[PDB]
């Protein structure tokens, strides 16, 4: 059971993105697309660093996007996390 759980963790992390949850193949239509997406676009470390930066930033100095995310994090709403969508999927026509 422990070995199967480890394998399941590995398979999930290798087949779908942590944040949005889209499969690897859709990003892999472009070469190296999945790792590009999971390491530059939807990196969880980047979200952690953004929370750090937004907390350590002064509230008066917040931009509009930062203020939106700040208010919504204060109210504990997680809709701002992209779920089922991404930049590429939104701009399929223009980007490609």
């Amino acid at each position: 059971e422990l070995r199967d759980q480890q394998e399941q963790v590995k398979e999930d992390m290798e087949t779908k993105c942590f944040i949005c949850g889209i499969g690897n193949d859709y990003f892999d239509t472009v070469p190296h697309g999945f790792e590009t997406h999971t390491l530059q676009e939807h990196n969880l470390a980047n979200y952690l660093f953004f929370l750090m930066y937004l907390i350590n930033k002064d509230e008066t100095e917040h931009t509009g996007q930062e203020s939106y995310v700040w208010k919504m994090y204060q109210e504990r709403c997680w809709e701002f996390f992209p779920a089922g969508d991404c930049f590429r999927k939104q701009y399929e026509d223009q980007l490609n």
Partner: protein, 184 residues
């Protein structure tokens, strides 16, 4: 940040890539400190956000204890985590990790002998093997082997490899002796 935003939002503007080629070095310098995330913006669109990542934050993130905590967190979320609580648990883990990396940054304020012996043994033993050729005294052997037959030919062919195997045995013995001297 301005140039990265412009490039990523205008992916096919030749004037823009030439200008980026001009701006190449600065972007390379600022690559580690540039953060990039995507959020579901107020205009019901996915918006990409750029911020600053500090060197201290990056180092504390790459410290091994934080990596172990990340692995444990991912294991827990994948195995016994639901889809509702995934982003809540992720934010809780982010908060705890941010606190621990800040505390770590706060507090953090300001074999070879065996390898050498083995290399020396290799050098010495191989040298002792090669002195036989280095004497350039093969003339005495050539005196008798001027009448070269197949039998003497094969005999020398075998003798060379036998000498190599003797050298290997001597080298292994020297390694064991040196290791014993080192441990003692």
């Amino acid at each position: 940040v301005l140039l990265t935003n412009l490039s990523e939002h205008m992916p096919n503007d030749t004037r823009l890539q030439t200008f980026l080629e001009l701006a190449e070095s600065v972007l390379n310098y600022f690559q580690p400190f540039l953060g990039r995330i995507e959020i579901m913006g107020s205009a019901k669109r996915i918006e990409r956000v750029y911020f600053e990542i500090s060197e201290s934050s990056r180092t504390q993130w790459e410290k091994p204890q934080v990596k172990e905590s990340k692995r444990q967190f991912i294991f827990d979320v994948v195995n016994e985590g639901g889809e509702k609580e995934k982003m809540e648990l992720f934010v809780n883990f982010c908060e705890d990790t941010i606190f621990e990396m800040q505390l770590a940054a706060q507090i953090s304020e300001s074999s070879i002998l065996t390898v050498r012996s083995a290399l020396f043994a290799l050098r010495y033993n191989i040298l002792t093997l090669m002195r036989m050729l280095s004497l350039k005294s093969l003339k005495k052997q050539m005196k008798k082997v001027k009448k070269m037959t197949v039998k003497d030919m094969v005999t020398a062919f075998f003798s060379s490899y036998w000498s190599i195997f003797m050298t290997l045995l001597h080298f292994v013995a020297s390694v064991f002796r040196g290791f014993f001297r080192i441990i003692c």
